[PDB]
Ligand binder design. Structure first.
Ligand SMILES: Cc1ccc(CN(C(=O)N[C@@H](CS(=O)(=O)C[C@]23C[C@H]4C[C@H](C[C@H](C4)C2)C3)C(=O)O)C(=O)c2ccc(-c3ccccc3)cc2)cc1
Ligand SMILES: Cc1ccc(CN(C(=O)N[C@@H](CS(=O)(=O)C[C@]23C[C@H]4C[C@H](C[C@H](C4)C2)C3)C(=O)O)C(=O)c2ccc(-c3ccccc3)cc2)cc1
Lengths: 144, 145
């Protein structure tokens, strides 16, 4: 019978197939294609701007009392000269480094908080620009 | 829909953060850890058994006319002598190679059908073994040492 294990097994199938296709330059779906391009873009960005990115991550002193306001202020400096795809990649890489740092410092509780901050920032600040500049599909075209 | 951006942007955040955490040996969730261990196990298996795996994948070529039974027949031979985690990894890798081949042959439509055959096989055949052998959490523990 179709219980809860069948649902989680389907999720594993989709994830594994998405991975294998991506290794050959193919994609499970357009969403998987966006996820893959953004994973690779973040790696490329972190490699190209290692030293300058280290200076950015050091600007936010994450503690269990850190509110969205503090994250928004640092991220706003990133988009000071306007929005572009590269600055959006830097934004994802920044939230990415904050999560790693939180777990390193045994503050795993902050990971869910960071994820919610990122979603709010995207929706409030970046989504209108993303829509006006061809959506995530254009980012995939440009990156590939 | 009213919640479509909220859903998709959240999905992107979760995916990217899961990826960054995994690169440093951490995991977003227990499900993310299962997914990562299975991705790495698949790569390991494919590397260790390159020649034997080539013999297996050459047994089946999916066309728009291929029925589930042809897939189930080949997969059944993987588990004729019993189930273990390594044979489960080989099953996932097998499905992955069938999907790659479908896209190589410009038949991307078959990838969702293969994924549904894999889910059916797991539900109809492997759930009792997975449960009895400690679930996917035991696979993660065993693979990680
Ligand atoms: C993968 C990647 C590679 C490079 C960059 C570097 N960069 C730019 O290259 N900026 C371009 C404008 S752009 O449209 O963003 C160009 C893109 C080229 C391809 C396809 C698509 C996504 C990627 C990769 C960027 C467009 C410019 O100004 O000439 C930047 O926008 C940039 C952003 C942030 C920092 C930075 C670094 C450390 C602390 C704070 C900020 C530096 C450069 C960012 C990502
Ligand atoms: C990542 C990986 C590495 C090796 C194998 C090879 N292998 C075994 O090594 N089998 C073990 C028993 S086991 O419980 O599967 C051991 C595991 C060790 C770690 C942690 C966890 C998942 C992985 C990796 C296997 C348990 C044995 O027999 O002593 C096999 O069971 C095996 C399965 C299928 C084929 C095969 C090859 C080509 C065409 C068709 C089938 C060959 C060997 C499969 C995966």
């Amino acid at each position: 019978p179709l219980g809860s294990m069948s649902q989680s097994n389907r999720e594993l199938v989709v994830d594994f197939l998405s991975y294998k296709l991506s290794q050959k330059g193919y994609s499970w779906s357009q969403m998987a294609a966006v996820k893959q391009a953004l994973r690779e873009a973040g790696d490329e960005f972190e490699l190209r701007y290692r030293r300058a990115f280290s200076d950015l991550t050091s600007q936010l002193h994450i503690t269990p009392g850190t509110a969205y306001q503090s994250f928004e202020q640092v991220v706003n400096e990133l988009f000071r000269d306007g929005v572009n795809w590269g600055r959006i990649v830097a934004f994802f890489s920044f939230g990415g480094a904050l999560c790693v740092e939180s777990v390193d410092k045994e503050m795993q509780v902050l990971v869910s908080r960071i994820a919610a901050w990122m979603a709010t920032y995207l929706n409030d600040h970046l989504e209108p620009w993303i829509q006006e500049n061809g959506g995530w599909d254009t980012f995939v075209e440009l990156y590939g």
